[PDB]
Amino acid sequence: WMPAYACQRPTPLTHHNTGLSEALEILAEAAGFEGSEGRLLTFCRAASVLKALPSPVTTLSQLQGLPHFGEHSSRVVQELLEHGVCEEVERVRRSERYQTMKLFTQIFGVGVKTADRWYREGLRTLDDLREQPQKLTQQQKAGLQHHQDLSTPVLRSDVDALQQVVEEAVGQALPGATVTLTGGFRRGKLQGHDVDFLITHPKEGQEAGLLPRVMCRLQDQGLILYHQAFERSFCIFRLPQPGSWKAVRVDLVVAPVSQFPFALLGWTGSKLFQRELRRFSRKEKGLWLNSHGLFDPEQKTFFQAASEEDIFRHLGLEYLPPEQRNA
DNA sequence: CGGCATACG
DNA sequence: CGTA
DNA sequence: GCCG
Ligand SMILES: O=c1ccn([C@H]2C[C@H](O)[C@@H](COP(=O)(O)NP(=O)(O)OP(=O)(O)O)O2)c(=O)[nH]1
Ligand SMILES: [Cl-]
Ligand SMILES: [Mg+2]
Ligand SMILES: [Mg+2]
Ligand code: NA
Numbered sequence: 001w002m003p004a005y006a007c008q009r010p011t012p013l014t015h016h017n018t019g020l021s022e023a024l025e026i027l028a029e030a031a032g033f034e035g036s037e038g039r040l041l042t043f044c045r046a047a048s049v050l051k052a053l054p055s056p057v058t059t060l061s062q063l064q065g066l067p068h069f070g071e072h073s074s075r076v077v078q079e080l081l082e083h084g085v086c087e088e089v090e091r092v093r094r095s096e097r098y099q100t101m102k103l104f105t106q107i108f109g110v111g112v113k114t115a116d117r118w119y120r121e122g123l124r125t126l127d128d129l130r131e132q133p134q135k136l137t138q139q140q141k142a143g144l145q146h147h148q149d150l151s152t153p154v155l156r157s158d159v160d161a162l163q164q165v166v167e168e169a170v171g172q173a174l175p176g177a178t179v180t181l182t183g184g185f186r187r188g189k190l191q192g193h194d195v196d197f198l199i200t201h202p203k204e205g206q207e208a209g210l211l212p213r214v215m216c217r218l219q220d221q222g223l224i225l226y227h228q229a230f231e232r233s234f235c236i237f238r239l240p241q242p243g244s245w246k247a248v249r250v251d252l253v254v255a256p257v258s259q260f261p262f263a264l265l266g267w268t269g270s271k272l273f274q275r276e277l278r279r280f281s282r283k284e285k286g287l288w289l290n291s292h293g294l295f296d297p298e299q300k301t302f303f304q305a306a307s308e309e310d311i312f313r314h315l316g317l318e319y320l321p322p323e324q325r326n327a
Numbered sequence: 328c329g330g331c332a333t334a335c336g
Numbered sequence: 337c338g339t340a
Numbered sequence: 341g342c343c344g
């Protein structure tokens with residue numbers, strides 16, 4: 001009753017196995033810090049299966065026949081069920097390696113490879129990085145300066161104000177261009193690490209060259225604290241607060257209207273949902289999916305899609321609204 | 328055992 | 337390398 | 341780490 005791919009089942013935002021999924025996601029995250037993508041994937045998938053269940057797991061036998069639960073993930077769940085704690089998970093949580101890789105990778109501009117190199121060099125804290133700013137890219141300097149504000153959740157109640165401001169710049173850049181809220185907030189999240197906006201125009205081709213024009217207008221209005229022909233922009237925005245403001249991460253992406261359904265599907269996530277959807281497409285359907293389109297490598301043809309609904313149908317999957325893509 | 332999503336800046 |  |  002549980003399909004193996006996350007895109008084959010509804011996954012709501014809130015569920016009945018929160019503590020169990022969070023524990024497996026710690027192990028997934030730690031696998032990622034050690035460069036083990038496959039283990040990261042298995043722990044993420046196992047976590048996701050639990051989010052999709054209709055009630056709490058209370059006994060080990062309820063894991064029988066669930067995909068992605070083998071000896072390791074089952075043992076994690078068993079210890080949590082028996083003791084309220086999994087020793088392996090706690091050991092990871094308090095390790096200096098986990099805590100520091102987590103701290104470093106949280107910085108905008110720093111990925112696993114950079115964090116790891118710094119870790120091997122003996123660096124442990126944000127102050128360690130600040131003291132040697134010679135070793136930092138301009139992106140990382142911005143990420144580090146703004147780190148405190150960027151560690152504060154963006155609130156859904158912030159989002160409408162930002163969208164209006166983006167729409168104003170977009171409207172001047174290209175009348176008729178639209179802004180669509182994507183990312184976690186579109187899946188119903190009440191908080192986020194950033195705000196993701198997808199921009200298009202109803203007349204195919206009119207959107208060419210649009211993003212630089214948008215960015216120049218936003219920067220002219222004094223709203224851009226950081227940004228770097230292009231179609232994706234990862235920036236840090238000045239967001240008004242009572243008597244002051246805070247720095248917020250905002251992503252902008254432009255797609256032609258022909259590709260909009262694919263870009264909307266990709267940017268709406270979740271990240272695991274999209275990886276599973278793409279894996280499903282390729283391995284089960286022999287079709288190649290990305291945020292631009294869906295390709296049949298035998299006919300050498302692209303599927304036209306007018307909606308996300310079209311794409312789920314192309315792939316032979318039941319439609320899932322964004323709120324059920326929280327894999 | 329091979330495979331693990333797929334792009335753009 | 338970073339990023340979504 | 342797990343599946344197929
Ligand atoms: O590696 C990625 C990262 C993101 N994405 C897609 C799915 C994800 O939901 C979307 C937005 O990326 P974010 O990093 O902004 N994550 P999300 O908005 O889901 O949550 P949050 O921003 O609150 O962390 O882009 C990928 O496809 N691959
Ligand atoms: Cl691995
Ligand atoms: Mg986001
Ligand atoms: Mg984003
Ligand atoms: Na980072």
